Design a binder for this molecule. Sequence first.
Ligand code: K
Ligand code: MG
Ligand code: MG
Ligand code: MG
Ligand code: MG
Ligand code: MG
Ligand code: MG
Ligand code: MG
Ligand code: MG
Ligand code: MG
Ligand code: MG
Lengths: 710, 705
Amino acid sequence: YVAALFFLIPLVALGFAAANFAAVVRKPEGTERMKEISSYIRSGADSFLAHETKAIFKVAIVIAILLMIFTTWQTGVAFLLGAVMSASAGIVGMKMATRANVRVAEAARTTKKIGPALKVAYQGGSVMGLSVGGFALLGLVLVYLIFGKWMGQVDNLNIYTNWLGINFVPFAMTVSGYALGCSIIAMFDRVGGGVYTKAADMAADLVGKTELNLPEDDPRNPATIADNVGDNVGDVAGLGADLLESFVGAIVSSIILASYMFPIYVQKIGENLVHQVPKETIQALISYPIFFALVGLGCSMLGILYVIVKKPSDNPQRELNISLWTSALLTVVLTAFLTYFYLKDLQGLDVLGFRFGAISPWFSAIIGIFSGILIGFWAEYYTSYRYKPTQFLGKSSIEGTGMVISNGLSLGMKSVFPPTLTLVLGILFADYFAGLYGVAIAALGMLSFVATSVSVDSYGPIADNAGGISEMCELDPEVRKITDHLDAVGNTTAAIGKGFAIGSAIFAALSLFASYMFSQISPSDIGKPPSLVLLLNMLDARVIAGALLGAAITYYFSGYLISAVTKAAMKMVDEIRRDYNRCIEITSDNALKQMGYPAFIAILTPLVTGFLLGAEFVGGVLIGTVLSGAMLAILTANSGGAWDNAKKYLEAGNLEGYGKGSEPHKALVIGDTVGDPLKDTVGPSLDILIKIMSVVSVIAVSIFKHVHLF
Amino acid sequence: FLIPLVALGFAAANFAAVVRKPEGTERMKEISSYIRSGADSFLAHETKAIFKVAIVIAILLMIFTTWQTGVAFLLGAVMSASAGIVGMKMATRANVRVAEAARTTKKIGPALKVAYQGGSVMGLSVGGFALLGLVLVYLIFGKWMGQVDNLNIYTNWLGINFVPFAMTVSGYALGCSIIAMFDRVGGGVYTKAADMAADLVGKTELNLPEDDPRNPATIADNVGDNVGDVAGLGADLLESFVGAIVSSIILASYMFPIYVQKIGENLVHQVPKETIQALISYPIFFALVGLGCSMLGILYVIVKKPSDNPQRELNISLWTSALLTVVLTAFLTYFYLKDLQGLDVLGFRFGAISPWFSAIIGIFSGILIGFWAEYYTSYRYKPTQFLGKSSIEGTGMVISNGLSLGMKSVFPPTLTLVLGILFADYFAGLYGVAIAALGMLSFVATSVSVDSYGPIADNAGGISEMCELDPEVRKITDHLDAVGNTTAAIGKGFAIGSAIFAALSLFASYMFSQISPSDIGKPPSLVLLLNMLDARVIAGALLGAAITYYFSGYLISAVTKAAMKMVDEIRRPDYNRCIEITSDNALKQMGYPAFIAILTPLVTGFLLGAEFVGGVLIGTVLSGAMLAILTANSGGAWDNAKKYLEAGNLEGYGKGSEPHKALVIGDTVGDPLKDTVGPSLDILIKIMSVVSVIAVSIFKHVHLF
Ligand SMILES: [K+]
Ligand SMILES: [Mg+2]
Ligand SMILES: [Mg+2]
Ligand SMILES: [Mg+2]
Ligand SMILES: [Mg+2]
Ligand SMILES: [Mg+2]
Ligand SMILES: [Mg+2]
Ligand SMILES: [Mg+2]
Ligand SMILES: [Mg+2]
Ligand SMILES: [Mg+2]
Ligand SMILES: [Mg+2]
């Protein structure tokens, strides 16, 4: 059937990525200094990766075994599968980037054009994105075929109460386990890598660039080499894991909502509870998001491939925008086709709330797509030094140092509002079209072109490593400006991807609340009206108290991340004043020690809060987490991006009279070091925290809903 | 009911008593005259703006609902403004008298007593004016109009149906909130603009010394120290206090129509009118008892034998007020609530005594939160010591360590708050949550007094450096100034906690206001409902939190903009002239945040309904509480680490060293944070909830989408 043709789509993406990987291997690169530094960086990064992989693999095996014990073993198997896909994607992307960084500089040098270097860097980012999408969708489709169909978990479609009092549909619990594995792996990777990279980057910019009076990414400074290794570890690898986790979370949330809507819609006629929604429609709505994602990945591949050969571009950011818009529009049209196919076979629209049937979530998905682009504009508007806010930041650089720090904080806080307003409008439209299911489909649509998003975002760190190499080689200030412009475009794309991830995570968390109350279902409650069950009162002191807790945990979590980054930076900065391996070891030891706590916190918070106060309190905690995490993520992303791009703005001498030697440049470097643990470490960790906490709550609520101490 | 008059008379007697204290050296008199002139001019500008805004808002309240609502708005505004004016004038008079007591007697005791009397005038004025306005509201509207007697939802000429008394008390609280907003936002922007300008002129090539008479910004900085801590901090505390009492009253008034039972063909109120009236009057009597206990503690400390230890005396005042409130309110609660029918239906677990249990819980929560704030800001404890030691390692390192310190500091006080909320609820539902809110602020007078003691000490240390005081007397004044900064941090944390609980209770009262005539037949769980599974509640929740963040940022840019305008004005002596320029600029920039805080619930409700607004309130409360605790603790830790290195606790490094420069940069960063952003957040969380409570009766059914 056509299902096999769609199952081939992730495999086609992997083959295309291997060809791009072979193209970079075929690229000469090979600069003796760059080759030696890149080989050392690859050895250190792969060793750090291997150590972290062994430890996390042991812990993940334990968690999967616990999942098999508490709930069905297929759930633990899905947990392992998701962990495998995420781990593989990160490694593939990082190796491709380590090879590609030298190729970008050499391509810009040999052709004397920015276009070819842009193409090779975008190819590296595309390798990362294709690996992300293909691995996630391959694991998901294999799960669906093996457990849903071959085992018939969807066929029975019966909630089973196993030991410990957990009642679950087998297929729904399995997909929940897959999403949970992806979330745990992504959080571990991003936290450790980000702490390492941000400690190294902050130490380098603060002492080497400022105190040592050395250019950014100076070769003599050990913190600079540690920073480039960190860029590869945290910025390249963590990014793919975070984006993949958000994408998987959106899809899994839609699937869970659909799977749980089937047993819930019953009408008691003649003392008999009749399913208001037939099973076939529910199965179709379960399969719809997977085909949606496959179509979106195909459109992403088409857009990227067309853009690479379309035309040499003088502006990298413009080409990235072209790629994103093409992928989005192709997804829109082909999803219109898929949606038309689905609305033919949908006659239960009124019972599901769907205004235009399948077309309603498609509109919702379209809305989500549009919202992403609009958010992508706003973040860009607030992060790019071409626009008014970052120019205002440079004026504050003229106005004083405390003024710089204060105005940058103000800039991020001001930046939070417009994208959130656009997002609220999108939420309203998604609900108006197709209730909670269309909210989840809009979550999916926002990341429907996740491959292109990951590619455009990962294009940045390759440019950062290339700029570090150029600064080490003392490249011509015009060419150094070219690579710094590529790095600034990459930072802008990092902010854009952070916004995409947080917005999709919000929509997924809304659907996850719906699934949480879906899990709070009982056979007697199933007879009760569905709207009465789908109830989470804020007046109840438990729910309002939990919201305060989740907000406090979110803030306390943000400081613990900074304290970890500073502690390694503290040793490094004193180390520089007092040996690249020494700073690398300081960052590595601090990250490997600090990485354990945040994931354990994110996993154990719902259990403790539920066994202490019940399920309403846990719902409140989820609420507060969603809110504070979204806000802090947008703030940190946009503020750090604006700080770094203002530093690049003044490094490009756009500010008359003042250059790298001037004191405002040192103030901007300090501001960039302040925003570094924010944009690259705190913000993304917040959205990963939000989704992992929501998934854990959805799974574990069946125990402490009635087995709660107070 | 005579107790508020006793508090007002007690403040007047202390005002007359301290005025009789000698003013001493003519030079000190001139410096105090500069400070007083600047403060009075700032007052005049803000008061003119406040008069215009208050007239407009009161007229709108009279039109939308009932004239009593606008009159109550005006009454609350008047009481708050009078308390603020009296307190600030008292402090401006008291600074030189404290300095002269320390100089002439060469002793810490008498100067401490005079400074405490100066702060006590402000605290007593706050308490007396607030409680007097409340008693007047009840006497005129509850009884003469018979609004309490009927205790029935009333449809006005515009067709809006609302319980009259609850709407009126909401209007009174709104007036108090408007005065608090003006004071805290405008004054804080002014204070940090002046403080930054003084430190900046000291730092820059054109050097005017900090805490020096020649510098106009230094005089403006001292005026601001008095403005923010005397007027603004007390304003925040009074707003939270009024919010707690009003929330309890609203809860009872709306509990009357909510708890109705249809038996056969007759609808009988599950809660009789007597129980509702008793629960309306209970928070007022609790607060009156707390004010009496606060006056007793203040009187004991002012007349206690002179002691060399000031912090012990302030703690004695606080503890005496708290314990007397605990015991006397135990008696009040047991005797007043014993004869009531229907407590179990409203959440009283242990009968009549349960709300008192909640209130004492609140008291304990307040003291514990103050401890946490101190622990994270004071250099005596580990975090600020670690910040000062890390100062050797770099400037960005200092900034990052301070950010991490604040974010880590947020957690323990919030844990205390969560435990207190859970226990207060377990005792007596949401009404007892509000009663715990009240108990935590039951001794608000002593809190405001101890808080206003601080800025007088800051001005005294500034004067000692300005007047080149004798190293023994200058050392005495420096010790008092350090004690004042510590107490300022403690009071700031306490204020943040009070604002948090007040916003929570106001949300509860908002949803109680979401009662409808048809809804009364439905089970009480159905009306007292704000489902999160609704897509509108989650969408609003994100919005209010984003607005809270945007609200914090606009303030930071405003302080820098005003400081530059002042600095250019300084380049253009006439301290009143530069202070007036700063006042005009800050009052002009204040309009946008005020429009945000007031109009967000209006627009969001008329667009999407009341569930969206409830979500907005939730997210705003959460994010504002977090950012307030963060900023307060971070600024306190930065300033105390700078003093730690000024106190040479870091071996080898003193004033002028590079770690000291990093700490100075961190302090300049934290000044617009602890003194401007945080308190404005505490005002925002509460004011948005109040506006929602009032306007929900309109936009609950008049919403576009
Ligand atoms: K970046
Ligand atoms: Mg770099
Ligand atoms: Mg870098
Ligand atoms: Mg960069
Ligand atoms: Mg940098
Ligand atoms: Mg950086
Ligand atoms: Mg000041
Ligand atoms: Mg200062
Ligand atoms: Mg002063
Ligand atoms: Mg001050
Ligand atoms: Mg200070």
